Design a protein around this ligand. Structure first.
Ligand SMILES: Nc1ncnc2c1ncn2[C@@H]1O[C@H](COP(=O)(O)OP(=O)(O)O)[C@@H](O)[C@H]1O
Ligand code: BEF
Ligand SMILES: [Mg+2]
Lengths: 65, 615
């Protein structure tokens, strides 16, 4: 009997690996690893990781002009 | 723009609002819209006078994008410079534009046209006895040109190598130079008696291009752009046969030269004795007074190392004053030193033939003063719907990278991830399933791969041959002949070697697993291989072009960057997320996680005469 507040992130192995790299550089990002598709993350860092992940993924996308 | 109230949405258009003008009463008939700022022209292809405007707009304005319904051209300084040469003046252009334009021409546009349309036709570059003379029919031009820092019926000599400089200076200065060859009155150059045999046929667009080139009656110099497989060889043969003068052709390949010569002889009545091929194997030249020399840029631009026979050939080329030069795939002439051949080689007329007039660097604009402006361009979808070329269902396959390789993708540097995302198992499995399905459909498949290691791995895994730079001419020809006429074989794995300038009437399906980065020109050149399929006229036929790309990688960036020219032409790629029925195939390559791990480790590990007896 123990409850822990947090944010559940559901994704695929690739996004999970990206999140693992981000957490390895910043341990506080991921609070815990649930499964190969689920990670428990800090509520405060959700709004920051979303924006930073969008910035990181922008590289793989070609946006002319 | 006087006393014109802006709209509430005018803010969204930053100096692009064009509502300050009014529409003419005959808007329902006039099909043209003109941009007063960007120079873009919107053409209605579904309204009267559309055909009458479709060619004039091509002549005066470069095409930006020409989709099915609404065409998009653009007027530029180079386009106006090309148009002003062929008997066209601002008065006539403005008259036709006003008669066809829903809106009146703005004073700014009039000023822009006037500034550039009145600075042509005062200098002519001629050649006499291997000497380049810059002849001007007027003398007063001297008081400014000779007084300019760079320059220096009257004629003065100029260094052959300095042509590349003087032409660019002429572009900068008011008067540019025009290269016209009156072969009718040219008697000094010996004539060559070759004519097109009755079996020859000229397509309507080829005839239109030839009319645009020879409308005045005097042969000019410039560039011709036609889609790959449109008949550029026949266009060049017709030009040579009508000029009837000594000609040298430069092609960027040896197989291309062989077929060039083969088609040359087949289409025209050129006697074999008057024909010479200048390649690495045989270097003999025709002993007749006039003939054709077909060589390559490597054999014409080299200056340091030459064989004895090749040195005699080069001396022959330099000593003789050629009459015509035909540059196949001219997009490579503005290279660091290939541009030197234009200045060194002596010729009264230069024609370039290329399906794409674009290149990565900014040197594309140098072609204006290197060889001249562009003459004609042809649409792709128009010919596809008219039956001149085939229709393609271009598709982009999204192959998801598996976690085992993606985890290494994250850590690996830039150089290794390239091989990593190119050798993913999902691509192998999709390729196997597609190969089986299309072989059951009876399609002739080509698989392109720039990476030699990936090509070899795929070939050894699938038991099919691979061709790349190391393959000899005889072996590759054997591969092609068997893939063509042998019922057992239906698919081959080609590489960058067969990207362009190869005629494959039988090839129908094209697949890309490895691509040469963002190269847009190579994209189109590779697509050109299957545009001349033998069964490209049967009802319901649609060729296939597959592009395999890994999602969530920079391969998507490069893939979306390398198709911006096809999208502009009108071709649209369809994203295929899944291929139905893939699981039912009996065997799939790299289907087991054990093999996945083994391949992971393998790919990661990839990176005194009597004393002579003594010895
Ligand atoms: N007018 C034509 N009549 C017959 N065949 C033609 C015609 N125009 C082009 N072709 C065919 O198109 C194919 C490609 O010609 P080719 O000169 O190699 O094109 P390109 O050099 O532009 O790639 C050849 O099979 C050629 O015979
Ligand atoms: F443009 Be072709 F294929 F020589
Ligand atoms: Mg060709």
């Amino acid at each position: 009997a123990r409850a822990r507040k947090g944010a559940l992130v559901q994704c695929d192995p690739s996004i999970k690996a990206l999140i693992l790299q981000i957490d390895a550089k910043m341990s506080d990002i991921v609070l815990e690893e649930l499964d190969d598709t689920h990670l428990l993350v800090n509520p405060s860092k959700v709004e920051f990781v979303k924006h930073e992940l969008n910035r990181l993924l922008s590289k793989n996308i070609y946006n002319p002009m | 723009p006087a006393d014109f109230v802006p709209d509430s949405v005018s803010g969204m258009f930053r100096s692009h609002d064009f509502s300050y003008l009014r529409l003419r009463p005959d808007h329902a008939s006039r099909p043209l819209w003109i941009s007063p700022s960007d120079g873009r022209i919107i053409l209605e292809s579904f309204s009267p006078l559309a055909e009458q405007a479709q060619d004039f707009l091509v002549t005066i304005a470069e095409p930006i994008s020409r989709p099915s319904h609404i065409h998009e051209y653009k007027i530029t300084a180079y386009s106006l410079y090309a148009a002003v040469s062929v008997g066209l003046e601002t008065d006539d252009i403005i008259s036709v534009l006003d008669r066809l334009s829903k809106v009146p021409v703005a004073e700014s546009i009039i000023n822009f046209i006037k500034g550039a349309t009145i600075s042509y036709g005062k200098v002519k570059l001629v050649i006499k006895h291997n000497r380049y003379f810059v002849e001007t029919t007027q003398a007063d031009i001297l008081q400014m040109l000779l007084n300019d820092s760079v320059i220096g019926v009257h004629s003065f000599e100029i260094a052959n190598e300095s042509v590349e400089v003087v032409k660019k200076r002429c572009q900068e200065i008011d008067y540019p130079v025009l290269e016209e060859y009156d072969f009718r009155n040219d008697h000094r150059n010996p004539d060559l008696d070759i004519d097109l045999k009755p079996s020859t046929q000229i397509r309507p667009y080829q005839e239109k291009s030839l009319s645009k080139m020879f409308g005045n009656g005097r042969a000019r110099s410039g560039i011709i752009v036609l889609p790959c497989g449109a008949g550029k060889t026949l266009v060049g043969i017709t030009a040579a046969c009508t000029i009837k003068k000594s000609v040298i052709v430069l092609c960027t390949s040896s197989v291309s030269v062989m077929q060039w010569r083969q088609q040359f002889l087949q289409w025209c009545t050129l006697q074999p004795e008057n024909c010479a091929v200048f390649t690495s194997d045989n270097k003999e030249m025709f002993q007749t007074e006039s003939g054709l020399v077909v060589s390559t840029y490597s054999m014409v631009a080299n200056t340091r190392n030459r064989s004895h026979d090749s040195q005699k050939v080069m001396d022959f080329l330099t000593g003789r004053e050629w009459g015509f030069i035909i540059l196949d795939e001219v997009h490579v002439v503005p290279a660091a030193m290939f541009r030197r051949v234009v200045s060194t080689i002596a010729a009264h007329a230069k024609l370039g033939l290329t399906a794409t007039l674009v290149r990565e660097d900014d040197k594309i604009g140098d072609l204006n003063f290197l060889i001249g402006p562009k003459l004609y361009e042809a649409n792709w979808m128009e010919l596809s719907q008219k039956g001149h070329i085939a229709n393609v269902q271009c598709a982009e396959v999204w192959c998801p990278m598996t976690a085992e390789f993606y985890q290494e993708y994250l850590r690996e540097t830039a150089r290794k991830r390239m091989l990593l995302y190119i050798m993913n198992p999902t691509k192998f499995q999709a390729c196997q399933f597609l190969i089986q399905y299309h072989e059951r459909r009876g399609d002739k498949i080509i698989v392109f791969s720039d990476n030699v290691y990936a090509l070899q791995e795929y070939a050894l895994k699938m038991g099919k041959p691979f061709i790349y730079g190391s393959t000899p001419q005889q072996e590759r020809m054997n591969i092609l002949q068997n893939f063509q006429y042998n019922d057992q074989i239906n698919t081959i794995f080609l590489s960058k070697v067969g990207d362009t300038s190869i005629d494959l009437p039988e090839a129908t399906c094209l697949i890309q697993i490895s691509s040469h980065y963002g190269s847009r020109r190579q994209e189109a050149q590779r697509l050109g291989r299957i545009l001349r399929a033998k069964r490209r006229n049967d009802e319901g036929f649609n060729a296939f072009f597959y592009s395999l790309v890994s999602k969530d990688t920079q391969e998507m960036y490069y893939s979306t960057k390398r198709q911006a020219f096809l999208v502009d032409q009108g071709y649209a790629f369809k994203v295929i997320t899944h291929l139905h029925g893939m699981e039912n195939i009996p065997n799939l390559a790299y289907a087991s996680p054990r093999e996945r791990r083994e391949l992971l480790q393998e790919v990661l590990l990839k990176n005194h005469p009597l004393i002579r007896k003594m010895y």
